[PDB]
C-alpha cells in the first residue's frame, strides 16, 4: 500500500511539475516581449540625445516611449496562466514536486 501511494504521488507530482515549466515559459514570452520593447526605447534615447534633434522630434520620441511603456504595463498587468496574474503582483508559487509534504 505504501508503494502505491508513493507511485501515485510521484506521477501526479511529476504531472504538476510540467505545469510549472509551462508557467515559466509563459512568463518568459511576456518578458521577452518586454525586453524587445526596452531595446527600442534605449535606441530611441540614444537618438534623442544629440543637440540636433528638435523639440518636435522629442515629442514624437516621447510619444513612442510612452506607448511602449503603456504596452509593458499592459502585457504584464493582464497575462495569466489559469487565472493567475503572473507579473501583476509579487508572491511565491509553491510546487508540490514529491509525495512528501
Amino acid at each position: 500500500n505504501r508503494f502505491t501511494a508513493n507511485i501515485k504521488g510521484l506521477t501526479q507530482a511529476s504531472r504538476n511539475a510540467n505545469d510549472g515549466i509551462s508557467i515559466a515559459q509563459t512568463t518568459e514570452g511576456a518578458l521577452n516581449e518586454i525586453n524587445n520593447n526596452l531595446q527600442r526605447v534605449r535606441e530611441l534615447a540614444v537618438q534623442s540625445a544629440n543637440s540636433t534633434n528638435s523639440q518636435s522630434d522629442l515629442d514624437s520620441i516621447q510619444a513612442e516611449i510612452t506607448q511602449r511603456l503603456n504596452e509593458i504595463d499592459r502585457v504584464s498587468g493582464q497575462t495569466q496562466f489559469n487565472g493567475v496574474k503572473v507579473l501583476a503582483q509579487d508572491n511565491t508559487l509553491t510546487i508540490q514536486v514529491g509525495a512528501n509534504d
Binding site: G29, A30, E33, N36, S60, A63, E64, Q67, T79
Partner: protein, 51 residues
C-alpha cells in the same frame, strides 16, 4: 451644418498654418503607427500563450 467659411481676409502667415497642420497630421500618424507595434507584440505574446 458646417461648410468652410470664405476667408475674411488674406492669411497673415501661410506657413505657420500649414506647419500646424503637418504637426497635427504627422503626430497623428506617429501615434497610429505605434499601435501597430503594440498589436504585433500582442500577437507574438498570444502565440506562445496558446502554445
Amino acid at each position: 451644418p458646417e461648410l468652410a467659411e470664405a476667408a475674411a481676409k488674406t492669411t497673415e502667415n501661410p506657413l505657420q498654418k500649414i506647419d500646424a497642420a503637418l504637426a497635427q497630421v504627422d503626430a497623428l500618424r506617429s501615434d497610429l503607427g505605434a499601435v501597430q507595434n503594440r498589436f504585433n507584440s500582442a500577437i507574438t505574446n498570444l502565440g506562445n500563450t496558446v502554445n
